[PDB]
Ligand binder design. Structure first.
Ligand SMILES: [Zn+2]
Length: 372
């Protein structure tokens, strides 16, 4: 029913509004706490972190609180109780902080870790297909080489060249005759095979939880660069190889067929028209299945590359979530004399979010009370 759908839609939109207003409130409280630590007053900051955790717990039923904001409060409160103690009063909640932080980190990382596992597993069926298909194709004397050869022999090569050219116009200037096509296709197949070996090796060498030199290199390269993105990290270098292989597996202006595959399709079409031995047609058909498998493998290899890249991005997101506001010395950075300007902006942000949250929770309570 569209009415139960309407009530659900109004409740979801309203709940999201409560969630955003609470996110803005908690964000302002954490910022104000970060200033108190910069000033030196560790106790006043601890009260704000404790309020962040208290408010999130109170509203956990009605709305969700960003795990990173809760982790920001939990971790920085733990930092004060491990070192700055006994300046901060103890509470019966202090013992739970370590496990809560670990749970928040685990919950946040769960998606990117599952996506690494799923992207890795997704590659096995297509790779087994590629191994099965390559067993059925002759490497030394391929079907298309023997089709070209017999076409030149019986002087039906002109019809073949015209049929290959018509399929392209639907690097044709790179070959004049059938022998020119033969050598051009040899080079293009060798190039594809070299592109495949390299892209697979590039992916293989990005697997596994990466080292600190890799995390930091990717961060200064494309996550948080000093100015413009560097495009020099192991992931960016691998993507340059993917682009190179894509330009040969597909055509420019990943969906449209390459000129190599188009030529191969036309040679197979010519072989069928001229009623060549079933062996040539079968091998040609297997080559078409192989081009299909290579395109599927490309997409799955790039998704696996993406999953591994995203895991590095997520680890940086975790590190940045716990990072506090620090006054710049000659993001979480404040100018030498903008400390008061930041405090004022945060105090007004808290005031507006407190007001918006009260209004939105009242409307949410109304929508909830219709079902009784
Ligand atoms: Zn990079």
């Amino acid at each position: 029913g569209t009415m139960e759908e309407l009530l659900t839609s109004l409740q979801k939109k309203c709940g999201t509004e409560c969630e955003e207003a609470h996110r803005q409130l908690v964000c302002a409280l954490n910022g104000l706490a970060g200033i108190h630590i910069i000033k030196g007053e560790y106790a006043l900051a601890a009260e704000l972190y404790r309020e962040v955790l208290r408010s999130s717990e109170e509203h956990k039923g009605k709305l969700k609180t960003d795990s990173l904001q809760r982790l920001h409060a939990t971790h920085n409160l733990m930092e004060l109780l491990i070192a700055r103690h006994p300046g901060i009063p103890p509470t019966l909640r202090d013992g739970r902080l370590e496990e809560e932080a670990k749970q928040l980190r685990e919950h946040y990382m769960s998606k990117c870790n599952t996506e690494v596992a799923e992207a890795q597993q997704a590659l096995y069926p297509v790779q087994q297909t590629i191994h099965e298909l390559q067993r059925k194709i002759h490497s030394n004397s391929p079907w298309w080489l023997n089709v070209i050869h017999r076409a030149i022999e019986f002087t039906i090569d002109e019809e073949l060249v015209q049929r290959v050219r018509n399929e392209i116009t639907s690097m044709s200037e790179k070959f004049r005759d059938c022998r020119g096509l033969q050598f051009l296709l040899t080079t293009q197949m060798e190039e594809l095979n070299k592109c495949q070996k390299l892209v697979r090796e590039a992916v293989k060498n990005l697997e596994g939880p990466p080292s600190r030199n890799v995390i930091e290199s990717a961060t200064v390269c494309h996550l948080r660069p000093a100015r413009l993105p560097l495009n020099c990290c192991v992931f960016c270098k691998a993507d340059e190889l993917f682009t190179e292989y894509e330009s040969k597996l597909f055509s420019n202006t990943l969906w449209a067929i390459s000129e190599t595959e188009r030529s191969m399709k036309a040679i197979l079409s010519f072989a069928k028209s001229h009623r060549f031995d079933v062996e040539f047609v079968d091998e040609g058909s297997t080559s078409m299945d192989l081009f299909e498998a290579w395109k599927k493998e490309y997409k799955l290899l790039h998704e696996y590359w993406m999953a591994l890249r995203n895991r590095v991005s997520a680890v940086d997101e975790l590190a940045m979530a716990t990072e506090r506001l620090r006054v710049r010395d000659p993001l979480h950075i404040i100018e030498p004399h903008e400390v008061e300007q930041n405090r004022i902006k945060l105090l007004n942000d808290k005031a507006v979010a407190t007001s918006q949250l009260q209004k939105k929770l009242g409307q949410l309570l109304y929508l909830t009370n219709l079902e009784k």
